[PDB]
Enzyme design. Structure first.
Site, PDB file in Angstrom:
ATOM      1  N   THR C   1      -7.931   7.637  -5.094  1.00  8.97           N
ATOM      2  CA  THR C   1      -9.242   7.349  -4.532  1.00  8.97           C
ATOM      3  C   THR C   1     -10.364   7.769  -5.473  1.00  8.97           C
ATOM      4  OG1 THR C   1     -10.807   8.112  -2.836  1.00  8.97           O
ATOM      5  CG2 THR C   1      -8.836   9.440  -3.217  1.00  8.97           C
ATOM      6  N   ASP C  17     -13.420   2.721  -3.858  1.00  6.43           N
ATOM      7  CA  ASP C  17     -12.381   1.729  -4.069  1.00  6.43           C
ATOM      8  C   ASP C  17     -11.625   1.501  -2.757  1.00  6.43           C
ATOM      9  OD1 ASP C  17     -10.887   4.142  -4.013  1.00  6.43           O
ATOM     10  OD2 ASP C  17      -9.320   3.197  -5.201  1.00  6.43           O
ATOM     11  N   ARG C  19      -7.879   1.126  -2.168  1.00 10.22           N
ATOM     12  CA  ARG C  19      -6.427   1.171  -2.218  1.00 10.22           C
ATOM     13  C   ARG C  19      -5.909   2.434  -1.557  1.00 10.22           C
ATOM     14  NH1 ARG C  19      -3.032   1.854  -7.780  1.00 10.22           N
ATOM     15  NH2 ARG C  19      -3.381  -0.402  -7.904  1.00 10.22           N
ATOM     16  N   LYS C  33     -13.339   3.089   3.094  1.00  8.98           N
ATOM     17  CA  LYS C  33     -13.590   4.518   2.989  1.00  8.98           C
ATOM     18  C   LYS C  33     -15.045   4.922   3.183  1.00  8.98           C
ATOM     19  CE  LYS C  33      -9.879   4.296  -0.330  1.00  8.98           C
ATOM     20  NZ  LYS C  33      -8.997   5.124  -1.189  1.00  8.98           N
ATOM     21  N   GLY C  47      -9.024  12.492   0.450  1.00  8.42           N
ATOM     22  CA  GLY C  47      -8.085  13.473   0.956  1.00  8.42           C
ATOM     23  C   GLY C  47      -7.227  12.938   2.078  1.00  8.42           C
ATOM     24  N   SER C 129      -9.452  11.355  -7.160  1.00  7.75           N
ATOM     25  CA  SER C 129      -8.562  11.622  -8.286  1.00  7.75           C
ATOM     26  C   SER C 129      -9.048  11.023  -9.597  1.00  7.75           C
ATOM     27  CB  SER C 129      -7.154  11.097  -7.991  1.00  7.75           C
ATOM     28  OG  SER C 129      -6.535  11.852  -6.973  1.00  7.75           O
ATOM     29  N   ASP C 166      -6.982   5.624 -13.489  1.00  4.53           N
ATOM     30  CA  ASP C 166      -6.294   6.434 -12.495  1.00  4.53           C
ATOM     31  C   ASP C 166      -5.217   5.598 -11.820  1.00  4.53           C
ATOM     32  OD1 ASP C 166      -6.003   8.929 -11.113  1.00  4.53           O
ATOM     33  OD2 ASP C 166      -6.875   7.964  -9.346  1.00  4.53           O
ATOM     34  N   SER C 169      -5.819   4.714  -7.867  1.00  3.75           N
ATOM     35  CA  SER C 169      -6.988   3.967  -7.429  1.00  3.75           C
ATOM     36  C   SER C 169      -6.891   2.524  -7.892  1.00  3.75           C
ATOM     37  CB  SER C 169      -8.291   4.571  -7.973  1.00  3.75           C
ATOM     38  OG  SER C 169      -8.238   5.980  -8.020  1.00  3.75           O
TER      39      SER C 169
END
Lengths: 229, 247, 197, 232, 240, 197, 233, 204
Positions: C1, C17, C19, C33, C47, C129, C166, C169
């Site tokens: 994320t 994002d 995913r 989100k 989280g 992340s 990342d 993500s």
């Protein structure tokens, strides 16, 4: 720490005179009127201040509960405030569990359950107020009424407070089932006008409506235009 | 404090319970309700008390309150207490189903409610509920049944009872027109209509002063169906015809 | 994320994002989100997604109540205080990290909220992340008192940098623009990835 | 919590609440029980059957266990509570000691409950009187009787309710080791002991018998009908 | 007029008319102290004035005050029973501190008033306690509206006002203030102290000395609640 | 380990169990009863940790008897199985969970025979035959090979004897005797014991 | 009108004054202390010949060396009897020795007056008890006989009579008793006074009698020995 | 792991005005099969089913509590529940036990009671609702049915092709899982019909 015995009891004839007396209290409030039309409801009250000193803007008699429900009252204002607060809490809990707006019938059932609890617990008196609930859900307008005992009904046009007998006697005649919301406002205002003993003004009354888009109370600038006719 | 106490749960100098005696007289003046048992199902038939023109018939009924997939009831007295009792009955039925994974029997339901009604007459200082109930249902063991409770907390099975107003004369005329074992649902409806027609002070019925529900078993399933205004009107016409023909 | 917000001249711009994973496998390709809290306050979440959902729903209900009871617009400081008091009461066991932001009678604000309950007011911030990847871009190109279009460009480029570097993500870019008048929601704002034909 | 003294003393040391509870139990339908050689029997009167009830639901003779049974007078709603508590107690005793209860054990439990409701805060007394019969492991029949005050005795034969004032005088004079020899002798004894108080005539009576085998057997209306003809 | 049946005049239960006599008696308890307050709000200021009648000259009059401070920008004046009013002031202070602690900003005057009013409504319903026999008046500056003036009562009713007056001479002290809200916005400038003192003196005929009143002030220029000194009060009195 | 078995036929529910009550390398008893009758047509078999079995089984039996005494008729095998599962599951996450493995056999006046399996996690199944213990691994494949849906009781006892003989040959435990009884229309019927002296 | 706890213009506690009047409506009992043991005796007061006489137990056993005889509300006395039994068993459990009649009377008297209707306990009494008691037994000092009232005052006696005819029973006990009796003359005179004051005829099934002596345990008289004694008299 | 202790595999797929749900039948303990007729799909409404996978005891418990609450709701309100409302209620039920949770991952599939618009959704053990538009999976062979559905799924499918695809996916998915199998049952929720089928699978 509190009394544990009931204050409302049965009489040799089976009556509950404490509830009858709370009703006699309600019969001495200010007039209220509700009228259900083909595409909305209308609540109209008599907000008549004692003298010119009182700032009118500070206190309201027509209040919202959610984005689609609103109510008015007749009887005692300090009790009305408690009822309004608990109704707001009830609606928030329902939305928390179901992620859906509560329907008007469920709202009225929960409020009447609270009002009934105050007729059988220990060391309390009953509320001295009757309610008029408004709502709109699933493409339909609703209009209920709650009593001090805990019994609720469903109407097409009703009237509370002082001179309610003549109010509904006059209300029965004009009422049409095809009535539009804008032409229902005239009848609601006219019904109030029958027993006012004064001169109508944009600060003597309060008016709320509810249609497809939600609940809102009209502003004095709009009450002015509606009173012009 | 002791000065303000009203002592709702004490005996009288003759062994009576005055609050219960007064709640029974409260229930005395309510709307007439009547039930009749037959070979293929039970039926309820109440009387509409609020007839104002400006009302709304949004609800599928006024005094029926389906309690389960197999039972239903009707009340007389105070609506506010009736609502509490109906919520409690639904909760009891669901707790039984959760524990045993089978539907509850009617006598067990009636018993579990009358315990709550009785606990309000012995301790607590509160007042008692002013409500009388009638029940109908169907279970594995005894089939079609019909019970009745009262404020004190004692029940009893019947075959044709009546509570409310003028229930005395209602039962009096019920005793002379009910024959055990041979009654079908249609003769039951006829007798119910013709009893309601008299025990109501009005000139004649109106098909909107009444409210009628039945209960049957069809294809291994229970069906609880409130009759409609046209059906009721047809029944009233039938009653009007035969009665007129005799004299 | 990857979540990231910025304070421009006349409001806030948030982004995220879309995913959701479960271990090393993509579960959802359109996980949302950016949550609603009030008509002028929004929130992003990273989280434990269940904790994010629960906490944001409870706070939104409390703010609706408070606004109904007072009769005026709610405040970013009130939302921040409610959130941090709850999260400290639970001693870090509710694992949510938030990027609360809004615009009230005082002006645009932007806070960071952490699982143990510590807060920090800032002009731009990132979480998740790919937070280091977005923070590098922000440090390299942020300018104070920016304009709307360039704020949107900057936040989308930060989110894209987090998406492409990342492993946890990817797949889309949402944007939410809050000003003193408007409330613009752009759910399919950018589509940097397309499945092979 | 409700904490008031409902039943309290009075000048001349009376408990008016208990006296009123007894004045209430003096209005129920008469019950009669006797103790036979190898059988025990009870019998209750039906004021009116109303031609429309289901008698299966208005029975005043229950079964607390395999070998114990009872019959009451007073208030049905209170009787039901007492009966269910006694059932739970019987099950607890079986569980803990691995043996069926004695008749005196359950009589003591019931009397303890009834007394506890005369000295607690915020309660009224029970308004029922009970007659408890049964057999034990020895093979000895018993017959007891409780009061709304919590006192219990053991009797050869007794009668509670209204009309017991004459049923007792009748049974006193007529009870003898001769009418006890056989079951169809004791049952006719009970029937004629009940009939002079039933002023309706015929059978408005329920009659249950309990022997060392086929427990709590209840006589059918036709069977009870036969005995009435025999007496006349 | 209104009949009685049972324990009507002893506890808070409905009369055969629905009147609640036991609450009409706390209003009479309000008139027991023998004082009178007057609050007036202006275009940029709110002012409180209060009679200061000490019985005789052994008391330390620096302690006999009816003016109180709730927060930095909210002030109050009580009327009725002294110990009741002290308990109510303590409750208001606690409510005002808890609001700030919970929500991060300072409580408004109408919110504080509504809190006090619903606290009193409960005394009107349960039967084991009695209603407090005191009235309350609040003033303050709202950052959005400006000056505000509110008043509660023992029944739980909490309207808002343009110019109030509570005490023994309530009816005529409001009949006087009635005539002067006709024009000029009731002298909407920092000298409504003139109006307050004149209204208090007209129906009392005292022409007070420089130390038989207390005055309090909030302004938009300085928002905090200030208590004016004797010299300041004297100058206004001298001008009169 | 203790042994349990059950076989449902057209109108019978033949069951069995062992009689050993070992404590350690020693054998304390030789004729132990692992069957708890609870109604005129309902049997309950139990294995697992000491104390738990009897404490748990007597509680179920007293509640079933109380139900009958209150209501004037008996519980059905389905109702008894579901009541048992409930009571067992409500203790799973409590402070004191039981460690019993069960088998409920019964017969009802409408549906006929019934055989219920229940492990110690309180998961309830219904089967035409089942078995608990370590010997279940060895005797589950003889029943698979020789069972028939319309098998008669004469052959059912034959098949049970074959299973017990396989255990006698191939197990490392010493289990010499087994109880055997049938539940048909006429209630429970104790049968001849099977010993391998 | 009043509460349960309410003094009078003479400081008398109305409810206790009524519970005391509740005793002049019971059946008479009698105890007598000797140098060789104690004896208790109580009238059974049968109502009708259909009541079993072996079902009226007014003389119970508290322990192997203490017995009790009651009068008043036999329904109320049972909680006191149970608590006395439990206390004696607790004392044995803790100290490996037998309790004393003084200690048992004192511990039982501490339940009286423990009533009220506000801030008392979760389940508490609502009125005073209506039973008077009579304890007898032997311990490390010899035979002893105590007496208990509903007010909670316990005394030590050597010849006490409680019930509805006590004002007449003591008028004879004070003349009969002397410090040189034997238990046999005690038993004889205790029977003579009962016969003197009762309404029925003193035969061998409408009375009760038990004795404790330094050698034996608590022992009840049989319908064999009792009959012989009555006939012998 | 605890959620791999009884096995199981559930699957739902969406078509053009139709939904489909499927499961396997095996009920067993760590490495040994007990029965082959275990029920994992429950009829919550006229056209509203729920499928549960994980620990079998918790499957049964959660199904029973859910039926409790849904009966009470439909008696109090007076109508049937919607797929979206049911999902929120289940999430609330599962989140009430955030610490010490049930080991079960549910799947919902229904039809809108007035627009007849499909709906599929899955929740995690703690109550996190994710709504999709193609398919959801849950169980021990999640990766296998992911690989199957991504390749075989098409948009706007008929009930016939929907049945073919969901069956062909479940078969090859469970043919590569040790603790799943013993047959597959498929429910097809159309507008006016609910067709049930049982497939022939491998029994090893």
């Amino acid at each position: 720490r509190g009394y544990s015995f009931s204050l409302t009891t049965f009489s040799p004839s089976g009556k509950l005179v404490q509830i009858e007396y709370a009703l006699a209290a309600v019969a001495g409030g200010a007039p209220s009127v509700g009228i259900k039309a083909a595409n909305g409801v209308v609540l109209a009250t008599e907000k008549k201040q004692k003298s010119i000193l009182y700032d009118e803007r500070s206190v309201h008699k027509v209040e919202p509960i959610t984005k689609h429900i609103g109510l008015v009252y007749s009887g005692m204002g300090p009790d009305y405030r408690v009822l309004v607060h608990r109704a707001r809490k009830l609606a928030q809990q329902y939305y928390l569990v179901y992620q859906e707006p509560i329907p008007t019938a469920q709202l009225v059932q929960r409020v009447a359950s609270v009002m009934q609890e105050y007729t059988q617990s220990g060391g309390v008196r009953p509320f001295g107020v009757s309610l008029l609930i408004c709502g709109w859900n699933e493409g339909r307008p609703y209009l209920f009424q709650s009593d001090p005992s805990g019994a609720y009904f469903a109407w097409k046009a009703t009237a509370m407070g002082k001179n309610y007998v003549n109010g509904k006697t006059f209300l029965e005649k004009r009422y049409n089932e095809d009535l539009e919301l804008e032409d229902a406002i005239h009848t609601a205002i006219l019904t109030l006008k029958e027993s006012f003993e004064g001169q109508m003004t944009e600060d003597n009354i309060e008016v709320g409506i509810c249609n497809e888009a939600g609940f809102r109370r009209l502003t004095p600038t709009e009450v002015r235009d509606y009173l012009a006719a | 404090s002791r000065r303000y106490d009203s002592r709702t749960t004490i005996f009288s100098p003759e062994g009576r319970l005055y609050q219960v005696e007064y709640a029974m007289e409260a229930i005395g003046h309510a709307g007439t309700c009547l039930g009749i048992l037959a070979n293929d199902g039970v039926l309820l038939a109440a009387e509409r008390r609020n007839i104002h023109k400006l009302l709304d018939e949004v609800f599928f009924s006024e005094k029926i309150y389906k309690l389960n997939e197999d039972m239903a009831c009707s009340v007389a007295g105070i609506t506010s207490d009736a609502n509490v009792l109906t919520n409690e009955l639904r909760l009891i039925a669901q707790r039984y189903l959760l524990q045993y994974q089978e539907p509850i029997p009617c006598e067990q339901l009636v018993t579990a409610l009358c315990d709550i009604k009785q606990a309000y007459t012995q301790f607590g200082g509160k007042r008692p509920f002013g409500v009388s109930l009638l029940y109908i249902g169907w279970d594995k063991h005894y089939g079609f049944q019909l019970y009745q409770s009262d404020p004190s907390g004692n029940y009893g099975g019947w075959k044709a009872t009546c509570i409310g107003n003028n229930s005395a004369a209602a039962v009096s005329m019920l005793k002379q027109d009910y024959k055990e074992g041979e009654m079908t649902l249609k003769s039951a409806l006829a007798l119910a209509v013709k009893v309601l027609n008299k025990t109501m002070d009005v000139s004649k019925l109106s098909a909107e002063k009444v409210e009628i529900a039945t209960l049957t078993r069809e294809n291994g399933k229970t069906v609880i169906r409130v009759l409609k205004q046209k059906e009721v009107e047809q029944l009233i016409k039938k009653h009007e015809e035969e009665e007129a023909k005799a004299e | 994320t990857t979540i990231a917000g910025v304070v421009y001249k006349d409001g806030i711009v948030l982004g995220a994002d879309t995913r959701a994973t479960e271990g090393m496998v993509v579960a959802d390709k359109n996980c949302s989100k950016i949550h609603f809290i009030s008509p002028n306050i929004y929130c992003c979440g990273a989280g434990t997604a269940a904790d994010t959902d629960m906490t944001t729903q409870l706070i939104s209900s409390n703010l609706e109540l408070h606004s109904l009871t007072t009769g005026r617009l709610p405040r970013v400081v009130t939302a921040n205080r409610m959130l941090k008091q709850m999260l400290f009461r639970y001693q870090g066991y509710i694992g949510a990290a938030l990027v609360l932001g809004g615009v009230d009678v005082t002006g645009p604000h932007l806070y960071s909220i952490y699982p143990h309950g510590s807060t920090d007011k800032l002009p731009y911030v990132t979480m998740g992340s790919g937070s280091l990847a977005a923070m590098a871009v922000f440090e390299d190109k942020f300018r104070p008192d920016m304009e709307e279009e360039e704020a949107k460009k900057l936040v989308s480029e930060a989110i894209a940098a987090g998406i492409f570097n990342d492993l946890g993500s990817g797949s889309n870019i949402d944007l939410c623009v809050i000003s003193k008048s408007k409330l613009d929601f752009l759910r399919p704002y950018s589509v940097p990835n397309k499945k092979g034909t | 919590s409700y904490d008031r003294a409902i039943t309290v003393f009075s000048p001349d040391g009376h408990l008016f609440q208990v006296e009123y509870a007894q004045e209430a139990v003096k209005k129920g339908s008469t019950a009669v029980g006797v103790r036979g050689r190898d059988i025990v029997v009870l019998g209750v009167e039906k004021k009116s059957v109303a031609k429309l009830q289901d008698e299966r639901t208005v029975r005043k003779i229950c079964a607390l266990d395999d070998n114990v049974c009872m019959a009451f007078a007073g208030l049905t709603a209170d009787a039901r509570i007492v009966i269910n508590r006694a059932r739970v107690e019987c099950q607890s005793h079986r569980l803990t000691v691995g043996d069926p209860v004695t008749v005196e054990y359950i009589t003591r439990y019931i009397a303890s409950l009834k007394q506890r409701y005369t000295q607690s805060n915020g309660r009224r007394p029970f308004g029922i009187s009970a007659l408890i019969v049964g057999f034990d492991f020895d093979g000895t029949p018993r017959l007891y009787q409780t009061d709304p005050s919590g006192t219990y005795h053991a009797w050869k034969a007794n009668a509670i309710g209204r009309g017991a004032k004459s049923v007792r005088e009748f049974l006193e004079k007529n009870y003898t080791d001769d009418a006890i020899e056989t079951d169809d002798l004791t049952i006719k004894l009970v029937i004629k002991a009940l009939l002079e108080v039933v002023q309706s005539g015929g059978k408005n009576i329920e009659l249950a018998v309990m022997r060392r085998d086929q427990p709590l057997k209840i006589l059918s209306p036709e069977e009870i009908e036969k005995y009435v003809a025999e007496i006349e | 007029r209104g009949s009685s049946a049972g324990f009507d005049r002893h506890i808070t239960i409905f009369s055969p008319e629905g009147r609640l006599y036991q609450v009409e008696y706390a209003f009479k308890a309000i008139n027991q102290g023998g004082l009178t307050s007057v609050a007036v709000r202006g275009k940029d200021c709110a002012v409180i004035v209060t009679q200061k009648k000490v019985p005789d000259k052994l008391l330390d009059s620096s302690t006999v005050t009816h003016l109180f401070k709730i927060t930095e920008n909210i002030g109050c004046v009580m009327t009725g029973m002294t110990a009741d009013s002290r308990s109510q002031v303590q409750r208001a202070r606690y409510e005002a501190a808890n609001w700030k602690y919970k929500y991060g900003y300072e409580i408004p005057v109408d919110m504080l008033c509504k809190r006090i009013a619903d606290i009193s409504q409960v005394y009107t319903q349960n039967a084991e306690m009695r209603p407090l026999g005191c009235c309350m008046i609040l003033i303050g500056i709202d950052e959005e509206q400006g000056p505000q003036v509110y008043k509660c009562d023992p029944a739980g009713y909490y309207c808002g006002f343009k110019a109030t007056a509570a005490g023994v001479k309530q009816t005529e002290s409001t009949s006087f203030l009635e005539k002067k809200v006709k024009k000029k916005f009731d002298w909407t400038f920092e000298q409504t102290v003139e109006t307050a003192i004149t209204c208090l003196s007209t129906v009392l005929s005292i022409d007070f000395k420089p130390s038989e009143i207390e005055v309090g002030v909030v302004t938009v220029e300085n928002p905090k609640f200030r208590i004016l000194t004797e010299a300041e009060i004297d100058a206004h009195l001298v001008a009169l | 380990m203790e042994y349990l078995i059950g076989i449902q036929g057209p109108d019978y529910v033949l069951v069995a169990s062992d009689r050993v009550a070992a404590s350690n390398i020693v054998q304390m008893k030789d004729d132990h009863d692992k069957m708890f009758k609870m109604s005129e047509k309902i049997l309950l078999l139990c294995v697992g940790e000491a104390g738990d079995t009897v404490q748990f089984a007597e509680y179920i039996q007293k509640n079933v008897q109380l139900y009958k005494m209150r209501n004037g008729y008996e519980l059905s095998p389905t109702a008894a199985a579901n009541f048992t599962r409930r009571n067992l599951a409500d203790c799973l996450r409590s402070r004191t969970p039981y460690h019993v493995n069960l088998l409920l056999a019964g017969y009802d006046e409408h549906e006929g025979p019934a055989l219920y399996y229940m492990d110690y996690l309180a998961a309830l199944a219904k089967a035409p035959f089942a078995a608990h213990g370590y010997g279940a691994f060895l005797t589950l494949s003889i029943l698979d090979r020789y069972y028939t849906p319309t098998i008669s009781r004469e052959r059912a006892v034959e098949l049970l004897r074959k299973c017990l003989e396989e255990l006698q040959k191939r197990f490392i435990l010493n289990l010499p005797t087994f109880s055997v009884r049938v539940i048909d229309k006429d209630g429970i019927h104790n049968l001849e014991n099977i010993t391998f002296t | 009108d009043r509460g349960v706890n309410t003094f009078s213009p003479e400081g008398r506690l109305f409810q206790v004054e009524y519970a005391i009047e509740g005793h002049k409506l019971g059946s008479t009992a009698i105890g007598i202390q000797t140098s060789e043991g104690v004896c208790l005796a109580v009238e059974k007061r049968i109502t009708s010949p259909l009541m079993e006489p072996s079902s009226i137990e007014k003389i119970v056993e508290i322990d192997a060396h203490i017995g009790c005889a009651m009068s008043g509300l036999i329904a109320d006395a049972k909680t006191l009897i149970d608590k006395a039994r439990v206390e004696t068993q607790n004392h044995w459990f803790t100290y490996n020795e037998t309790m004393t009649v003084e200690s048992v009377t004192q511990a039982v008297s501490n339940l009286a007056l423990q009533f009220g209707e506000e801030d008392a306990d979760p389940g508490a009494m609502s009125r005073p008890f209506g039973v008077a008691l009579l304890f007898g037994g032997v311990d490390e000092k010899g035979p002893q006989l105590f007496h208990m009232d509903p007010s909670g005052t316990f005394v030590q006696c050597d010849a006490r009579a409680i019930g509805s005819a006590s004002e007449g029973a003591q008028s004879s006990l004070q003349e009969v008793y002397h410090k040189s009796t034997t238990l046999k003359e005690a038993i004889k005179s205790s029977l003579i006074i009962l016969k003197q004051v009762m309404e029925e005829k003193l035969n061998a099934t409408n009375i009760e009698l038990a004795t404790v002596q330094p050698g034996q345990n608590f022992h009840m008289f049989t319908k064999e020995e009792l009959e012989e004694v009555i006939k012998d008299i | 792991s605890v959620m791999s202790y009884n096995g199981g595999a559930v699957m739902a797929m969406k078509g053009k005005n139709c939904v489909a749900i499927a499961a396997d039948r095996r009920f067993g303990i760590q490495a040994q099969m007990v029965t082959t007729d275990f029920q994992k799909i429950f009829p919550m409404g006229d056209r509203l089913y729920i499928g549960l996978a994980g620990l079998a005891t918790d499957v049964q418990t959660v199904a029973q509590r859910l039926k409790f609450r849904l009966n009470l709701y439909e008696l109090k309100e007076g109508r049937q529940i919607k797929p979206y409302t049911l999902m929120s209620m289940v999430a609330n039920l599962l989140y009430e036990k955030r610490f010490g949770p049930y080991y079960t991952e549910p799947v919902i599939a229904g039809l809108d009671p007035k627009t007849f618009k499909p709906f599929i959704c899955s929740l995690d053990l703690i109550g996190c609702p994710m709504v999709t538009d193609d398919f959801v999976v849950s169980g021990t062979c999640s990766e296998q049915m992911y690989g199957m559905c991504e390749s075989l799924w098409e948009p706007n499918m008929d009930p016939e092709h929907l049945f073919e695809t969901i069956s062909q996916a479940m078969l090859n998915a469970v043919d590569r899982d040790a603790v799943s199998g013993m047959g597959v049952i498929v429910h097809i929720i159309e507008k006016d019909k609910i067709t049930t089928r049982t497939l022939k699978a491998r029994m090893d």
